[PDB]
Design a protein around this ligand. Structure first.
Ligand code: CLA
Ligand code: CLA
Ligand code: CLA
Ligand code: CLA
Ligand code: CLA
Ligand code: CLA
Ligand code: CLA
Ligand code: CLA
Ligand code: CLA
Ligand SMILES: CC(=O)O[C@H]1CC(C)(C)C(=C=C/C(C)=C/C=C/C(C)=C/C=C/C=C(C)/C=C/C=C(\C)C(=O)C[C@@]23O[C@]2(C)C[C@@H](O)CC3(C)C)[C@](C)(O)C1
Lengths: 163, 168, 220
């Protein structure tokens, strides 16, 4: 009803009443899911732009398949073999399930008000990144399906100084 | 375990994985024994490899049906031309040595690996107390070195490239 | 958390800053000073023997700054002071003629690279030994250069106030050199040229814009 993540641009934004009564556990699970989807969206937005200008020269499949040649965007999933996707998914699962490659020194020792404001800002930035990723995916798919549709050319219609 | 030999200036004691932690004494002795054995094996392997790659090859190194010594190459790839039964005898000899004098047959236990077979001493009481520690530490240090480096000699042989000093 | 420190007067700083270390103005908006940054997975760690997280961060900052201070001069010197008189009877095939700093990396024999790596590894090992032995009492820096007590071929002596001002100058130049090395490297990468060939043209004129000359006859 009233917790972190309520800021004045609007105020509550629950039109369809997806929560209504629920419970503390269900609300906490929903908050965790929102934070996870938000962090994933922010990482996706950051990673959708970097390869346009920089490229690591590693040979996914030694001998050939060298990053320097695979397409960027939604066309990489077809080029990358299934083995690499499985390996990286298993790796991130090892990171998530266990404490491996994770350090509790990032929790920090911030005071209460600072922590609350920082959490609200984190949620806001992530909520923006979600729709950012949605728009990126829709533009990429529409352009790839039919070249010339949505005449704005190049990936990343903004930031035209890259090209 | 915090004052035993092998903990010296360039790092003092160094247990990053922390496998020791709680232990008795059998584990420490077993780890020391395996470290020393890997040592000895690796120094002899590296010395043989460097003396073979130097270019000095035995005349009587010739094998069955002539197979002149100049034909023998270097490395794992170059080793695939020596007789199979010759290396079978060689491995018989080494497993024999594993089941032979290389053991505390006498029953003397100055330190882990001090077999000495009570018969072939070259002078052991002559050295002072600090000299024994210095020699054991230098043997162990002159070991850890060999062990890792040789893995590289083995890694670099198959990886391919041009290492310094050694030609390749 | 203290409010309105020197620099960021409209922000705040964690209380871990305090005074003590030289060059502290209060710049710490994020954090990094309220976490165990020198004790969690430290293999050399030693309870009742290590320093404070802030001193560990100061050591890291000093290392990065020293490297950058050397790197700035390394970038600048060969461009305008000429290359080393080497390549004589060395069989380098103009390997030193290149001046583009990102081009000479692929023409230098591995002897120099491995010599440099080994020497700096030796210096780092000396630093590690000193850090391990000075326990929770490290004057910071260590490596025993020209200050009385360690190696001092020129016998440099200074009053404590001289030492404090020298420390302040060192840290200021370290930060400035970090910024300068970053800028120089990225400018060289972007323009494909060294700094001298990039600044020299913008000094007199382009050829297509300067006038033809003076052709009026004299004496008529
Ligand atoms: C047939 C001859 C023979 C016999 C009977 C022995 C007998 C023995 N050796 Mg031995 N050894 C021999 C030949 C022989 N050796 C040769 C030719 C070498 C090379 C020079 C060695 C090197 C060697 C070392 C270095 C050690 C022994 C040890 C031992 C003892 C315990 C071995 C054990 O637990 O089983 C072996 C059981 C295993 C499950 C093998 C373990 C394999 C390790 C963990 C990994 C191997 C990785 C592999 C090489 C690479 C894989 C391929 C790669 C692509 C990934 C035992 C007395 C050990 C010892 O004295 O401690 C008690 C010891 O530390 N030996
Ligand atoms: C082996 C890999 C692995 C494993 C075991 C998990 C395990 C989990 N993830 Mg998960 N995840 C993974 C990879 C993995 N993830 C990857 C690669 C991504 C993409 C970034 C995500 C994105 C993700 C989101 C967005 C969410 C989870 C959630 C969850 C949890 C509940 C899943 C659920 O309800 O059913 C399915 C669970 C702890 C959910 C969660 O914890 O919130 C309830 C959730 O909302 N995951
Ligand atoms: C949704 C996230 C996501 C996904 C699915 C991908 C997927 C892909 N990226 Mg990518 N990338 C991402 C985020 C992502 N990236 C981000 C955030 C960046 C900026 C750093 C990049 C930068 C990048 C480059 C420069 C390149 C790729 C490439 C690729 C492709 C080859 C696989 C690979 O090497 O991945 C690499 C994936 C990463 C490097 C992301 C790792 C991010 C994790 C979270 C960092 C974890 C912390 C880190 C270890 C340091 C810890 C310190 C502590 C303070 C945190 C593949 C399609 C390559 C390619 O050919 O693309 C066409 C390539 O050269 N990516
Ligand atoms: C020493 C460790 C090690 C070793 C030996 C390998 C070996 C290999 N990796 Mg690899 N990898 C590792 C660690 C390692 N990886 C780590 C730590 C990462 C970071 C996440 C990666 C990320 C990675 C990527 C991104 C890719 C590889 C690929 C490859 C293969 C090269 C091409 C090939 O042979 O195709 C032959 C391939 C096969 C015969 C199929 C192998 C299928 C894998 C082994 C199944 C993995 C299952 C997974 C781990 C657990 C189950 C799923 C999980 C959700 C429960 C090769 C088998 C490439 C590849 O697979 O291309 C095909 C590739 O694109 N690796
Ligand atoms: C796929 C690889 C992978 C992934 C997904 C993670 C994931 C994570 N690591 Mg991690 N880590 C990894 C590999 C990975 N690790 C490896 C190989 C190491 C080195 C051993 C580390 C060392 C490490 C440390 C030391 C810490 C983490 C932390 C974290 C967490 C927060 C990361 C964050 O916010 O910064 C991700 C930020 C970015 C991707 C932005 C990149 C910025 C670009 C590059 C600028 C240009 C998160 C659970 C932190 C944590 O859990 O604290 C709570 C933490 O303290 N990791
Ligand atoms: C198989 C070879 C082997 C074995 C069994 C050991 C065993 C040991 N080493 Mg050692 N070491 C080795 C190779 C080996 N070393 C090599 C090649 C180097 C050079 C890089 C070193 C460098 C080294 C240092 C600098 C120190 C030790 C120390 C030690 C002892 C403490 C435990 C430890 O660090 O284990 C090493 C780790 C393992 C055996 C795990 C390997 C598992 C793999 C997956 C222990 C008896 C310490 C000591 O003497 O304490 C008094 C110590 O300070 N080692
Ligand atoms: C004293 C007893 C004895 C006897 C009778 C032999 C007899 C023989 N050895 Mg031999 N050997 C001995 C001790 C002995 N060895 C010892 C102590 C060692 C050191 C471990 C070797 C190491 C050795 C090697 C490495 C090789 C032989 C080979 C041979 C055979 C020569 C092949 C040939 O010319 O065919 C007619 C021959 C049957 C060779 C062989 O059979 O392989 C072709 C061979 O390559 N021996
Ligand atoms: C790898 C093992 C190793 C180790 C531990 C040492 C250790 C040592 N060597 Mg040495 N050396 C080695 C290998 C090694 N060397 C090799 C392979 C050669 C060539 C055959 C030499 C040739 C050599 C000579 C000719 C001399 C030494 C000397 C010394 C001693 C003083 C070092 C010094 O003051 O330089 C410290 C140097 C620096 C700190 C320079 C660093 C400058 C900046 C920081 C470079 C930054 C590098 C950067 C981070 C890496 C990325 C760049 C890269 C892509 C190129 C020291 C005991 C000297 C001495 O008095 O001993 C007899 C001496 O005169 N060595
Ligand atoms: C007074 C100092 C000074 C001056 C005159 C210039 C001058 C220039 N810089 Mg520059 N730069 C400086 C400091 C300076 N920079 C610093 C301190 C940094 C670090 C943040 C940078 C980072 C920087 C970048 C990243 C780039 C330039 C570029 C440029 C050129 C446009 C121009 C020659 C650009 C350039 O040369 O592209 C061709 C370019 O991409 N500069
Ligand atoms: C102590 C230690 O060890 O580490 C510590 C370090 C530190 C920092 C303290 C820690 C932290 C917190 C973290 C990780 C903070 C990182 C936060 C981060 C990186 C947040 C990204 C936001 C991105 C957004 C909002 C993008 C919007 C994108 C938008 C709005 C777009 O429109 C995208 C766009 O594409 C469109 C749709 C159209 C295109 O034509 C144009 C562009 C490209 C513009 C940790 C976790 O405690 C660990």
């Amino acid at each position: 009803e009233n917790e972190i993540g309520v800021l004045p641009p609007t105020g509550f934004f629950d039109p369809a009443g997806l929560s209504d009564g629920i419970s503390q556990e269900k609300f906490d699970s929903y908050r965790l899911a929102e934070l996870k989807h938000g962090r994933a969206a922010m990482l996706a937005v950051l990673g959708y732009v970097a390869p346009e200008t920089y490229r690591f020269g590693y040979d996914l499949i030694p001998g050939e398949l060298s990053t320097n040649d695979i397409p960027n965007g939604v066309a990489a999933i077809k080029a990358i073999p299934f083995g690499g996707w499985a390996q990286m998914i298993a790796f991130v699962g090892c990171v998530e399930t266990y404490g491996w490659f994770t350090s509790p020194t990032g929790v920090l020792d911030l005071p209460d008000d600072i922590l609350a404001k920082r959490q609200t800002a984190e949620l806001q930035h992530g909520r923006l990144a979600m729709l950012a990723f949605l728009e990126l995916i829709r533009h990429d798919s529409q352009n790839l399906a039919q070249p010339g549709f949505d005449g704005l050319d190049n990936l990343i219609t903004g930031l035209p100084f890259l090209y | 375990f915090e004052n035993e030999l092998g903990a010296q200036p360039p790092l003092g004691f160094f247990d990053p994985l922390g496998m020791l932690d709680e232990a008795g004494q059998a584990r420490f002795d077993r780890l020391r024994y395996v470290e020393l054995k890997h040592g000895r094996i690796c120094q002899l392997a590296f010395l043989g490899n460097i003396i073979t790659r130097a270019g000095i090859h035995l005349p009587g190194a010739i094998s069955l049906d002539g197979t002149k010594f100049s034909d023998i190459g270097n490395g794992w790839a170059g080793s695939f031309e020596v007789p199979k039964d010759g290396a079978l005898q060689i491995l018989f000899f080494v497993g024999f040595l594993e089941l032979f004098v290389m053991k505390d047959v006498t029953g003397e236990g100055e330190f882990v690996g001090d077999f000495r077979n009570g018969a072939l001493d070259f002078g052991w009481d002559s050295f002072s107390e600090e000299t024994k520690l210095q020699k054991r530490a230098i043997e162990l240090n002159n070991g850890r070195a060999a062990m890792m480096g040789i893995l590289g000699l083995m890694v670099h042989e198959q990886l391919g490239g041009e290492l310094p000093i050694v030609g390749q | 958390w203290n409010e309105a420190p020197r620099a960021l007067p409209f922000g705040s700083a964690p209380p871990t800053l305090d005074g003590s270390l030289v060059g502290d103005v209060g710049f710490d908006p994020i954090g990094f000073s309220t976490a165990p940054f020198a004790s969690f997975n430290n293999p050399i760690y030693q309870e009742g023997n290590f320093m404070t997280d802030v001193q560990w961060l100061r050591e890291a900052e000093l290392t990065h700054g020293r490297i950058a201070q050397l790197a700035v001069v390394g970038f600048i010197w060969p461009a305008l002071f000429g290359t080393f008189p080497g390549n004589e009877n060395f069989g380098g095939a103009d390997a030193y003629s290149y001046v583009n700093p990102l081009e000479a990396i692929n023409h230098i024999p591995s002897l120099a690279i491995y010599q440099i790596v080994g020497g700096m590894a030796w210096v780092e090992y000396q630093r590690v030994q000193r850090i391990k032995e000075q326990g929770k009492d490290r004057i910071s820096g260590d490596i025993g250069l020209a200050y009385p007590g360690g190696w001092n071929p020129f016998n440099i002596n200074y009053s404590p106030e001289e030492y404090a001002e020298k420390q302040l100058q060192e840290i200021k130049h370290c930060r400035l050199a970090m910024l300068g090395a970053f800028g120089l490297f990225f400018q060289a990468l972007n323009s494909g040229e060294d700094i001298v060939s990039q600044l020299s043209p913008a000094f007199a004129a382009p050829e297509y814009a300067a006038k033809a000359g003076y052709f009026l006859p004299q004496g008529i």
